[PDB]
Amino acid sequence: HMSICTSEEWQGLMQFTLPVRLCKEIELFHFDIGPFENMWPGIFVYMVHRSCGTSCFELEKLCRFIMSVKKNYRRVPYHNWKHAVTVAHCMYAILQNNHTLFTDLERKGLLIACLCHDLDHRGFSNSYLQKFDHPLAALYSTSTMEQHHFSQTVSILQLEGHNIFSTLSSSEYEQVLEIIRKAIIATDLALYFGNRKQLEEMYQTGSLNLNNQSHRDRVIGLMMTACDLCSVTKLWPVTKLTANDIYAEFWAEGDEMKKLGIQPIPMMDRDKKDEVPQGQLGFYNAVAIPCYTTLTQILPPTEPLLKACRDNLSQWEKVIRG
């Protein structure tokens, strides 16, 4: 049933080379992919090659995969192709800065999981799909969209010449598919609060063990949340423009509920626009800051993300105060 790229789409990507001016800034946590739309597939290939290497995936199969992933992202205001590449770039920056903590299998799984984490997003929350009994909520009871994203990732891999992991042994293939599954499910924000709480306890009690697989899955989970929210870690003009995209999607969801005679929560009500700066300050204080704080504790080189997150928070306070 899945959407596949055209021969010309993936063959075109194969050629593309990244401009040398970006070579140094792509390494930075605050790097914005925003002004380089036509380059995004090429940026992802660049990140796979710079991080993993030029021979980790057969270039043909990788370019087919990327171009098909792009096709299965909708024209929604926020959960689109741009978001997928932005999230993968944040993961790239984290992996590069913590080069001796993850396996080659984790490094490639995580980059793929990040690119596929919102695959075929309809621009609707899990609450909307569940409340209005959408076929997807009937399919997946909890973490509705997240289950669909992993399903859309598997179905893409299973297309003709799209299996980038075909060269792995049956054990390593099941292993990478498991890393991807868990990583994509962790992007359900509802799950983050408990995961971060458990990690904070393990860190404080000194019981956090990177050797223990369950502990590892939790750290990876928080890394996925940290990447998912990274728009709060860019420079203020980029952050501010991404917030407009997030609210355009929230408001479109509320317009749908209104059309059905349902009053949406203020966050999804375009008539409650004036509350956005305060809404943002609470999000930074209750979600973003704890996220990057715990991440910096577990992985100290991720500190620039906490620093940029704090800079945007003070910018939001400035807006509230005028």
Ligand SMILES: Cc1nc(C)c(CNc2nc(OCCCc3ccc4ccccc4n3)nc(Cl)c2C)s1
């Ligand atoms: C379309 C999206 N689906 C999810 C799950 C997303 C998560 N990621 C973010 N979520 C938010 O939510 C901010 C709303 C906070 C909020 C509260 C109450 C309000 C009341 C009135 C008006 C606005 C109000 N805003 N901000 C940022 Cl910067 C990110 C990265 S985005």
Ligand SMILES: [Mg+2]
């Ligand atoms: Mg998602």
Ligand SMILES: [Zn+2]
């Ligand atoms: Zn996302």
